């Protein structure tokens, strides 16, 4: 009898040593959308 | 309650001028601002542009840069829109419409509110 | 010829849920807020609105904004005879220096 250890991965990802490499991904960025001002919330605003 | 006010019908000859006056009722004029926006009869909405009522400063559509004059008077909290060298695409409702950014650079990060009749 | 490009028809029977799309560009509705005015013949446009999505006191939760990349779109549901109206998208424009409107879409519920 054998015992072993033990997917899809279409989002890719950069890193220095390995280059570009298939993964899923944890996205840190996001394009902000602009709006109107507002109040800095600490602190009073003039 | 915010109202807005604005003078009487008016025909003219092609080549003349028209300035249409905006009164405005029910909040603080002088931190608000007036956007202009015209519809030819069965048509669309043409943004025209928009003045301060906390400083005078104004900005046009590119189309009517030239043309077109906004002042504005806080004694009366009164808006007026000048066009000149009316030709017959000028034909239309004129409507004032209360806007809410007063200072800045005007880059539609706010937007216009209430439409007068 | 309308920056905003919106049917000029939409229709539903009452009851139903109807959608006008407002189709445009980068410079406009891909970086700027979606407003959305409704007007009866012969009045002046309301606020539908605002913000792409949000809703201006009066206005029922039977209107809804929807934005996605350089479209936009508003969602009528339970459609009701009094919807019978124009329905005009409106964004800014950082390429033309100035706020722009689509072309109106007439929403016909008999």
């Known amino acids: 009898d054998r015992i072993c250890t033990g997917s899809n991965s279409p989002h890719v990802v950069k890193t220095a040593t390995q280059g570009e490499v298939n993964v899923g991904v944890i996205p840190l960025t996001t394009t902000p959308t602009k709006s109107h001002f507002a109040n800095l919330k600490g602190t009073e605003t003039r | 309650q915010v109202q807005l006010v604005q003078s009487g019908a008016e025909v003219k000859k092609p080549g003349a001028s028209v300035r249409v006056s905006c009164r405005a009722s029910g909040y603080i004029f002088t931190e608000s601002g007036i956007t202009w926006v015209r519809q030819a009869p069965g048509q669309g909405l043409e943004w025209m542009g928009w003045?301060?009522?906390?400083?005078?400063?104004?900005k046009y559509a590119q189309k009517l840069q030239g043309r077109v004059t906004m002042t504005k008077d806080t004694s009366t909290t009164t808006a007026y829109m000048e066009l000149r060298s009316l030709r017959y695409d000028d034909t239309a409702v004129y409507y004032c419409?209360?806007?809410?950014?007063?200072?800045?650079?005007?880059?539609?990060?706010?937007?216009?509110?209430?439409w007068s009749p | 010829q309308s920056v905003l490009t919106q049917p000029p028809s939409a229709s539903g029977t009452p009851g139903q849920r109807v959608t006008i799309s407002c189709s445009g560009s980068?410079?406009?509705?891909?970086?700027?807020?979606v407003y959305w005015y409704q007007q009866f013949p012969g009045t002046a446009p309301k606020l539908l609105i605002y913000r792409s999505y949000q809703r201006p006191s009066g206005v029922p939760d039977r209107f809804s904004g929807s934005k996605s990349g350089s479209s936009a779109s508003l969602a009528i549901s339970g459609l009701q005879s009094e919807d019978e109206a124009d329905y005009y998208c409106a964004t800014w424009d950082d390429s033309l220096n100035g706020w722009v409107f689509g072309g109106g879409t007439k929403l016909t519920v008999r």
């Open positions: 419409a209360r806007d809410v950014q007063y200072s800045g650079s005007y880059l539609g990060a706010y937007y216009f509110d209430y």
């Open positions: 980068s410079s406009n509705i891909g970086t700027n807020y």
């Open positions: 003045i301060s009522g906390y400083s005078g400063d104004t």
